[PDB]
Design a protein around this ligand. Structure first.
Ligand code: PEB
Ligand code: PEB
Ligand code: PEB
Ligand code: PEB
Ligand code: PEB
Ligand code: PEB
Ligand code: PEB
Ligand code: PEB
Ligand code: PEB
Ligand code: PEB
Ligand code: CYC
Ligand code: CYC
Lengths: 84, 161, 205, 160, 164, 177, 177, 177, 160
């Protein structure tokens, strides 16, 4: 939530559009301190790199409401708000 | 809605009290500034369209929100937002005349953030447009009336944020 | 320069040639109340580009001006201990950095606004526009001979409108608060170096 | 879109599309190819259309570019040509959609409010659109120009 | 900022002496004049929309060649920035009539004046045409008093002599 | 981790832009020497796995009773879980270094850990020995005085930074005690 | 440098405006009391001599440690420098009183005198007091409450000028502290 | 100061060797299109006065706050200093272009300029926009792509000199940043 | 009229006039004499007011009388001055009525439709009314000019 607020993506997820958010827990963010993921996301700590933090965060938001029972034994491909 | 007089009378009546010296203090305070308030309200009614035009021109007229993709691109959205700014100016004038922001709570701010969030209207740009309108309005009405109007402009911006 | 008849004086001359000697010049002659009885050596290290000369040491050597729109807070800074002055430096340095790294984004927005109207201006260049009046004294232009009734504006640039002129003012307002906070770190450095030189005298620090 | 409008008008009445509506959808999908061709021609000749329309407008309405006019100066003239380009793009959208829904939902609803808030005379925009209409119809065949001006006329009527 | 007190304090400062009777004498001269040179600042402060409009177009009336294509006032913002400059100059005259010296004219409009205009191709004749028009549009018993009319014109002709 | 630094720059935020932001506190920490803190946490995350392995092998080659039957490091699960626990403690102290503040080190791992190890019968002093071994490895990696391992840094002194993790590891070792 | 007339001009120039009647009064009160001011300063200049000898000898009369073997005003060379400095400070305070403004007593007296006194080793506690006194003499000479000498004047109130010079003297004291 | 001929001599003297034919071809190429360099520099000296006016007025045309009251290029004294500084920078860039080396640009012009502008309060952003406009004018005058004025020459390619002066201009920009 | 409006607003609620409404009617009938005096002064100085307002308008908006402008020619200029006289008369009516009911019921309801159908720019009419306001307030005292411009401001607001 802190990253959503300071990043500006809060406006996107506050819209009425049916979204499926895949928010990572605080454990997930604490688990970035391993070497591999650190080498890829360390420069997102610099205060001038908000533009890439925005795309990383927007990749977690899916248009449409996918419940867990909706996805049993199904393989779905979609585009998230990052366009990927 | 309740103005300054209504608020004083309510505070006195909710205790079974007669209007004592402090109520007289507040009532005199309102009665002394009423004429300045009427002057400012008249001047603002005179120049509402130009105030909104100048605020929009200085705040969001050439930014990216008015381009394709932005939250006020098409003509429908442009007209809707200028109507919103007219609402804000008119209700700030009502609040300045009344000397009490309760009308803003009852008629403007109640469920406004939720409507804007459901529609997707950017709140920061709206607050900045209201701030630009505060500049022009204080400019046009002079220092004292501008501080009075800016009180309710900031009230709207705080209720929106 | 001085001739046979003038007492020598500190020459302030806008060429100064090698820039470095101007910072040396304001460092060597600083203040009206400083003298040369008991001062350390000053210029071997800035002459060989090793010690960077401090920005506030130029300010104390320069003659002072009346228009001081970012007034020097050398005398409105309170007498507070060294560590809190260290803290107040770091907040101001961070805030001077954060106002910089959005000012370049305003520059990108200006460069994008000109890409918005690139072919429109090319179309507008070769097309004949002849105005209705105002360019020759035979016709009646009225109050558009020159502009009317106090609407020249505070600057001439505020009257003219456009997409690029609107982001011009956005650049010009985040401007003044960057140089507000950037003139705050100079006198804070002047307070910190002051207290270090206070510790270098024989005392409890 | 014609398909969309037929579907909503049939949806309000709680009925399937009658054979007339299906006939008309069929005729539309059959003409889609020449619709795309006409949109091609109008789309890729945009520079000349905007330029020559801007000329005819500025010769018919010298006040808007006269000293102090709304489009007075380099930047304001560029912005006005930008608006004309906007409306040409919307006309191409409407040509491919087969109906003025794209033009009217984008650029016509609330256009008077916007142009009044900006201080722009709406009659000047109407003149510019008419000039662009003549310039664009000059480059088409008889039947094609007739069908293409069909949308410029609607845009002019809505912009009175 | 050469006022009457900056002149005597720095002159006493050179010799590092204490303000003597010479230096005290100059300040009462800023008492007898300064009761009436500040009414000119009243006349200039409330009338400044009209006196820079009336003088702003006087230079364009004399020099109509400026409004051509590719000149000083080629477009409208050229005229807006020219009226800005006439407002700036009359503001410094209003400062000079207040302080009691030509300080604010010197270090804010006169120092580095020739250089700028020369490089910016701004005719000096157009600038002096407005100040000279304002100097003779003033008649003494209608606008101000007799003490004010001479001291208001004296700061104008000083800038006229300094600009060219 | 990700939210340790403010990164104020935002466009059309409608909450962030034209609104108050952590300018006074977040910016100063970042300006003041965050490159040293970044080389620091990089020198931890590139060496972390060898650190917990060398730590638990140093604990075992000091006290073999845990690897004896009846020990806490016997069984398939214990070796796997103890390695996991030591690495978790390493990750949290690496975050606490990156933040310059030990609040989440309290709130997410050190809050109620000692009573958990008492309820599981985990011996405390062996884990204290382990985190002291990690403290020595951390300050060795931070002084670039690893006898076995080399990274190139921009030249300078990181002595102030080194103490930081000693205070944090002592906070862990006292909170488990 | 500035005076009282120039400071309203500098303050109004950063607001882009002419000299209106809204703030023109205060200057008429400042110009109307011009004669009183000139009566005020002449009282200090005429007793500028005795003031430094009563100040600097009182400094030693309250502190006999600034004259012993290893004290700053100890020897004959240092006593002259201190008696010179006291009269320089009094001269600039009289400049600021005649000017009505404190522009000259900020960039040509106290500006760059903090490190100058720090490099020499001049006591700050002995300096403040020294300048503080000169203040007690000046407020007695302004109001004609001096016990040893009385002057001739027109009757009335002068606490405004006494207060202005009292605000100048501890402005001197705050800069060297 | 150095030029293009001297820098290979300085570079080879720190290697202790004579000037052989191995590298005796880059200097011969500097010689052969050396007449192109004299054709190159003359186009900047021909339009030096228009370049500073088009640059500094464009700076205000994109930033009207410099001439707001209080701004850096606000008054008549400060405008002359800025128009002087722009032409000084252009003069040193023309020196470096004629020399074929940026040695004269560093020590006599850029050495100590950044904190000179910091101490004066000169805003760096407007300065960078001022040098970059002059860079855009210079690369148009070198290649004869100027829309307002064309010059006479022998035909061919000049992107090497345009790129040398383009590398000099943001070298100026990096030092004052 | 204030009396009329009080009566209708009390009539909708099915009640007699409260003592506040009667107080206000009383204050109105007491001020009727200076209302008539002010209406006198504005009424019988109509020629200078219309003339000087027409000048300030034509100097501020030279396009309307430029060649081809809406008020271009002798007859069109006369008609525009006629309109300004209409609005001055309505302002006098409103001054004597004590409320903008006469001004708004005659000349404000549907004014945009009329002036759009005639091809006249409404902003020019607003400029003319503002110029007439300055000219007319120049001839009154401080409090009188304040009360008289009170109606010009309403007419300008309605004519945006
Ligand atoms: C505080 C003291 C003070 C002054 C005395 C003036 C002096 C002055 N004038 C100009 C600047 C100017 N002055 C003019 C005026 C004219 N040029 C023309 O085209 C017309 C013929 C002529 C009207 C008489 C113009 C157009 C500029 C802008 C430069 C340009 O566009 O070339 C500038 C450059 C900054 C600016 O744009 O304002 C300065 C410092 N301004 C001040 O701030
Ligand atoms: C503070 C500076 C300041 C000025 C320099 C004048 C400048 C000035 N003069 C006039 C306007 C006038 N000024 C005069 C005065 C005179 N014409 C003569 O032939 C006589 C020689 C002389 C004194 C009797 C006259 C007769 C008019 C009206 C005609 C005109 O515009 O020239 C006006 C228009 C309004 C007005 O009358 O004030 C202004 C602003 N006013 C100022 O506020
Ligand atoms: C008998 C059992 C036994 C062991 C398993 C080792 C375990 C071990 N390693 C170190 C000590 C260390 N361990 C490391 C860790 C590493 N070095 C690297 O270069 C790799 C990247 C990384 C994983 C191998 C470092 C950097 C030091 C400090 C330098 C050193 O002493 O080698 C220490 C000393 C810590 C202290 O108390 O101060 C111990 C006990 N030693 C033992 O006595
Ligand atoms: C957020 C922070 C966080 C942690 C640090 C761990 C803390 C932790 N460790 C264990 C659980 C355990 N922890 C250990 C660890 C050790 N035993 C020893 O003898 C050594 C001293 C040490 C390894 C070096 C072992 C062996 C178990 C399993 C005990 C069992 O088998 O029941 C448990 C119980 C759940 C489980 O059994 O998995 C918890 C909560 N979990 C967390 O959520
Ligand atoms: C996002 C990833 C990221 C990083 C890993 C760092 C990498 C990094 N470190 C420094 C720069 C530096 N880094 C260090 C730190 C050290 N030097 C030592 O010799 C010690 C071993 C260690 C102390 C902990 C020092 C002393 C400097 C130079 C001064 C400084 O900039 O802090 C710099 C600026 C100069 C340069 O480019 O080298 C950068 C980019 N910064 C980042 O943005
Ligand atoms: C050996 C111990 C010793 C002392 C303690 C001092 C005595 C002394 N006298 C004054 C105080 C003063 N000193 C003077 C000075 C003078 N009075 C005149 O009329 C003359 C013109 C002039 C000197 C010739 C004045 C005017 C006062 C203020 C009180 C007064 O009017 O006497 C003060 C200041 C009071 C304070 O600290 O606030 C002190 C400390 N001198 C000493 O030598
Ligand atoms: C260089 C020579 C020179 C001077 C020194 C002064 C001299 C001086 N002072 C005053 C006149 C005065 N001077 C004072 C001042 C004081 N009265 C007291 O009781 C206190 C001791 C002292 C306060 C500082 C007062 C109160 C008046 C009369 C009121 C006034 O002038 O405003 C007057 C009478 C004229 C007037 O009323 O203004 C004169 C000539 N003027 C000069 O031209
Ligand atoms: C050898 C190389 C060399 C230089 C580069 C210059 C550098 C330089 N510039 C200034 C001085 C200045 N420089 C500027 C310039 C500007 N303000 C802005 O925002 C713009 C970015 C820019 C104009 C384009 C101004 C405005 C001053 C005067 C400061 C003032 O008085 O307000 C000074 C102080 C001397 C003076 O006051 O003139 C110096 C040394 N001089 C040199 O000798
Ligand atoms: C008021 C707003 C205002 C502006 C936006 C600028 C307009 C302007 N012109 C140029 C750009 C230029 N300016 C010149 C300069 C000249 N051309 C010539 O042929 C002459 C010899 C000489 C001036 C007399 C040149 C050569 C270019 C490059 C493009 C071109 O060839 O025109 C640039 C640089 C483009 C960039 O930023 O990268 C700008 C910003 N001037 C203004 O006043
Ligand atoms: C001080 C006087 C003086 C000069 C100015 C130069 C003048 C000059 N330039 C060139 C000759 C030339 N000059 C250019 C340069 C250019 N051509 C273009 O199309 C671009 C506009 C521009 C790139 C910068 C080229 C391409 C040649 C011919 C090729 C060459 O000389 O190598 C020549 C012909 C001799 C030759 O071939 O070398 C001469 C005399 N030499 C002088 O003695
Ligand atoms: C897709 C539908 C659509 C339209 C049409 C649209 C118009 C639109 N026109 C604008 C400005 C403008 N438009 C004009 C146009 C004109 N001046 C004249 O005299 C002529 C009559 C006319 C040209 C034919 C001018 C001069 C401005 C700038 C006004 C100003 O900034 O003062 C602006 C504000 C700046 C900007 O362009 O972003 C918008 C949003 N937006 C939309 O989303
Ligand atoms: C009492 C309320 C009221 C009004 C206001 C009113 C207006 C009115 N204005 C008219 C015309 C007109 N009005 C104008 C006015 C103007 N031209 C300009 O450029 C200016 C902006 C403006 C003058 C300020 C012109 C030029 C005509 C003639 C138009 C034509 O015949 O083409 C006409 C048609 C001819 C006629 O006057 O009978 C009517 C009815 N009628 C009313 O009952």
């Amino acid at each position: 939530v802190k990253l959503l607020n300071e990043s500006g993506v809060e406006k996107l997820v506050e819209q009425a559009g049916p979204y499926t958010v895949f928010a990572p827990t605080d454990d997930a963010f604490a688990a970035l301190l391993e070497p591999h993921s650190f080498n890829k996301l360390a420069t997102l700590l610099r205060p001038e790199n908000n533009d890439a933090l925005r795309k990383v965060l927007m990749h977690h938001v899916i248009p449409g409401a996918f419940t867990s029972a909706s996805l049993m034994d199904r393989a779905v491909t979609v585009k998230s708000l990052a366009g990927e | 809605m309740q103005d300054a007089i209504t608020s004083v009378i309510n505070a006195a009546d909710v205790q079974g009290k007669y209007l004592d010296a402090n109520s007289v203090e507040k009532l005199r305070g309102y009665f002394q500034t009423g004429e300045l308030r009427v002057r400012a309200a008249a001047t603002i009614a005179a120049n509402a369209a130009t105030i909104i035009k100048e605020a929009v021109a200085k705040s969001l007229l050439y930014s990216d929100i008015t381009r394709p993709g932005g939250n006020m691109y098409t003509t429908r959205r442009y007209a809707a937002c200028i109507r919103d700014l007219d609402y804000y100016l008119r209700y700030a004038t009502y609040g300045m005349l009344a000397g009490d922001p309760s009308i803003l709570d009852e008629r403007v701010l109640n469920g406004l953030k939720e409507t804007y969030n459901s529609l997707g209207v950017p709140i920061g740009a709206t607050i900045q447009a209201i701030q630009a309108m505060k500049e022009v309005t204080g400019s046009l009405v002079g220092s004292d009336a501008g501080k009075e109007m800016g009180l309710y402009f900031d009230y709207i911006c705080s209720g929106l944020s | 320069v001085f001739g046979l008849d003038t007492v020598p004086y500190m020459r302030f001359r806008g060429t100064y040639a090698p820039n470095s000697t101007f910072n040396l010049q304001c460092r060597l002659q600083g203040g009206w109340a400083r003298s040369d009885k008991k001062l350390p050596m000053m210029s071997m290290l800035p002459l060989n580009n090793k010690a960077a000369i401090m920005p506030h040491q130029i300010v104390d050597g320069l003659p002072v001006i009346p228009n001081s729109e970012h007034p020097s807070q050398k005398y409105n800074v309170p007498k507070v201990s060294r560590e809190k002055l260290q803290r107040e430096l770091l907040i101001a340095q961070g805030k001077a950095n954060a106002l910089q790294i959005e000012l370049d984004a305003a520059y990108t927005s200006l460069a994008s606004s000109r890409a918005f109207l690139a072919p429109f201006a090319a179309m507008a260049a070769d097309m004949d526009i002849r105005p209705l009046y105002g360019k020759n004294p035979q016709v009646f232009a009225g109050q558009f001979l020159g502009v009317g009734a106090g609407q020249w504006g505070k600057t001439g640039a505020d009257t003219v409108r456009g997409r690029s002129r609107r982001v011009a003012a956005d650049i010009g307002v985040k401007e003044f608060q960057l140089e507000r906070v950037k003139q705050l770190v100079v006198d804070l450095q002047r307070a910190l170096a002051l207290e270090d030189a206070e510790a270098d005298a024989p005392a409890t620090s | 879109s014609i398909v969309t409008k037929s579907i909503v008008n049939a949806d309000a009445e709680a009925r399937y599309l009658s054979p007339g509506e299906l006939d008309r959808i069929k005729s539309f999908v059959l003409s889609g190819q020449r619709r795309l061709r006409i949109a091609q021609t109008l789309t890729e000749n945009r520079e000349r259309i905007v330029k020559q329309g801007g000329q005819q407008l500025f010769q018919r309405r010298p006040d808007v570019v006269s000293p102090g006019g709304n489009a007075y100066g380099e930047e304001m003239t560029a912005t006005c040509l930008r608006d004309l380009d906007y409306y040409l793009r919307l006309v191409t959208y409407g040509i491919i959609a087969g109906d003025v829904t794209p033009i009217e939902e984008i650029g016509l609803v609330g256009v008077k409010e916007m142009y009044s808030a900006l201080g722009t005379p709406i009659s000047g925009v109407a003149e510019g659109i008419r000039c662009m209409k003549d310039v664009a119809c000059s480059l088409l065949s008889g039947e094609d120009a007739a069908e293409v001006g069909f949308y410029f006329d609607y845009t002019l009527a809505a912009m009175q | 900022m050469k006022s009457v007190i900056t002149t005597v304090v720095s002159a006493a400062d050179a010799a590092g002496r204490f303000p003597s009777n010479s230096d005290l004498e100059s300040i009462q001269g800023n008492i007898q004049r300064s009761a009436a040179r500040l009414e000119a600042a009243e006349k200039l402060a409330g009338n400044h929309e009209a006196v820079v409009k009336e003088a702003g177009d006087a230079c364009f009336a004399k020099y109509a060649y400026l409004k051509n294509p590719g000149e000083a006032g080629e477009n409208q913002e050229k005229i807006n920035k020219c009226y800005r400059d006439v407002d700036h100059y009359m503001r410094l005259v209003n400062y000079c009539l207040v302080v009691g010296g030509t300080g604010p004219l010197d270090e804010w409009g006169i120092a580095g004046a020739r250089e700028v205009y020369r490089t910016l191709n701004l005719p000096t004749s157009a600038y002096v045409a407005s100040i000279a028009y304002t100097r003779d549009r003033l008649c003494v018993p209608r606008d101000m008093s007799a003490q004010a009319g001479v001291e208001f014109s004296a700061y104008l002709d000083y800038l006229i002599n300094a600009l060219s | 981790m990700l939210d340790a630094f403010s990164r104020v720059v935002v466009n059309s935020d409608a909450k962030a832009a034209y609104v108050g932001g952590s300018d006074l506190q977040a910016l100063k920490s970042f300006i003041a020497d965050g490159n040293k803190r970044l080389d620091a946490v990089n020198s931890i995350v590139s060496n972390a796995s060898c650190m917990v392995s060398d730590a638990v092998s140093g604990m075992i080659c000091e006290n073999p009773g845990l690897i004896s039957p009846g020990g806490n490091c016997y069984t398939n699960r214990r070796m796997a879980a103890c390695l996991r626990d030591g690495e978790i403690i390493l990750r949290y102290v690496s975050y606490a270094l990156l933040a310059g503040d030990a609040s989440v080190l309290e709130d997410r791992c050190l809050n109620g850990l000692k009573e958990t190890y008492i309820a599981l019968g985990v011996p405390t002093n062996s884990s204290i020995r382990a985190v002291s071994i990690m403290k020595a490895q951390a300050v060795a990696f931070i002084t670039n005085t690893a006898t076995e391992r080399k990274m190139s840094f921009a030249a300078g002194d990181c002595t102030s930074l080194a103490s930081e993790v000693a205070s944090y590891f002592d906070r862990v070792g006292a909170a488990i005690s």
